[PDB]
Amino acid sequence: QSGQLTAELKRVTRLAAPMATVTIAQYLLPVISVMVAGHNGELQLSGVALATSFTNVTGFSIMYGLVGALETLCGQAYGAKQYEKIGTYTYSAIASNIPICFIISIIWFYIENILISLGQDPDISRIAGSYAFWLIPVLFAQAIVIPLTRFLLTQGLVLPLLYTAVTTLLFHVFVCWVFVLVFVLGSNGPAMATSVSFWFYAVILSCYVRFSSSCEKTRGFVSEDFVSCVKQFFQYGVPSAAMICLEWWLFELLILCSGLLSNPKLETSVLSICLTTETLHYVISSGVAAAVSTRVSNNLGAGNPQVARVSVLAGLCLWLVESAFFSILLFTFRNIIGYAFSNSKEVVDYVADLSPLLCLSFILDGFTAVLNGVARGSGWQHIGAWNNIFSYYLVGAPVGVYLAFRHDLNGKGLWCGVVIGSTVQATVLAIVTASMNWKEQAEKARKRIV
């Protein structure tokens, strides 16, 4: 019980701290692209931003979201010591990612035409389509990279994941410098640089997995298990992708809706601050979520339902410390933190007025991240996808648009809808996790990976 929790707290933390740093590096890479570019003109900035929003919505959200299937399959397979199937699951995921990358590439070919038909400036549209075209190799590199990241994570190999992720980040800073400053490749420079970095990420990961002693038992695949693994990859990858797509889409929709409020420059700038602050906090809870998913899937696959419950409890301990830390820290500098993003007194005062709501977002996002990690580790990501629709699009979006436009709350009203949607999401997640039959979920894990 108490020693149960202490041992599981140790293992959850041993995975959460490196994975939190991994997520930091993940989200720092696009920020480095924007910073090294340091774009001078509105035409370039808008076109690149449109390419980023389009490629994230239609492509990158799916690529990252699909490997939640590997969090279920490879995690439970590692728990049952079904080590050969881990590599079969991983390589079935890579092979399945190839046609999806082709579909997304075809869509990205039409980004200029689609944006023009959507009433956007033709120069902006061409710049966006060109940037996205040079982001296409990132898709095929991620077809290897992302499944390999779960290949290492599900086995508890978070240190090589952290090493290669940070090494890729520093490599990306270098190639951004050479492409933007030395080669002077222009607006497409960072996009081309990203394609190089992720392919570099692809080779070092593939090199480690191929040659390390840690991956000797789990590397390789079984031919007669390929088709079945592909089936399961889609079975749990389709909802896992939907969960991420609905989270990223809502982010984009928030910014889009802020452009329709009065004084849209003020409301969009301030909403950009709330979003940046939200993701800045979410990298930590993402590391906790990855640790909870790994330990939940491992213990379920190992036939230990009780320690799986304890894994959720240990992750909730990390959530309470982490969320209380960032909430109180933000509330302390609520009247000051705005000056870290803008020199306008109006923007800083606005962010100061929203900071309590952002603190509530910290608590909820950390809680829902942990419980969504339980979903990915157990196998009911479909509940999480339908919960994302119900919480944010059926409840959060109508209430937020209402308060923003009706009660003249503007961006505060939009974030009020975010807070309410996150509240009902946490409530559903808490009810489904408290009513879970852990012995059956372990039995379902044993059958899922045989």
Ligand SMILES: CCCCCCCC/C=C/CCCCCCCC(=O)OC[C@H](O)CO
């Ligand atoms: C006022 C309205 C309140 C309700 C509104 C919620 C709408 C969104 C919730 C969807 C989750 C549906 C809950 C289904 C619970 C089934 C439990 C279950 O399936 O556990 C098996 C495990 O997932 C192995 O498959």
Ligand SMILES: CCCCCCCC/C=C\CCCCCCCC(=O)OC[C@H](O)CO
């Ligand atoms: C087999 C599965 C293959 C998957 C292949 C991709 C699937 C997702 C693509 C589109 C749906 C996304 C929702 C609609 C996206 C609309 C485009 C958009 O977001 O445009 C933004 C721009 O800012 C406007 O001005």
Ligand SMILES: CCCCCCCC/C=C\CCCCCCCC(=O)OC[C@H](O)CO
């Ligand atoms: C099984 C789950 C099925 C899920 C079914 C749910 C349907 C989602 C509905 C709308 C999302 C729209 C997504 C597209 C949002 C893109 C908007 C955008 O790109 O905004 C411009 C950007 O902010 C630059 O200004």
Ligand SMILES: [Rb+]
């Ligand atoms: Rb979210």
Ligand SMILES: [Rb+]
């Ligand atoms: Rb959000």
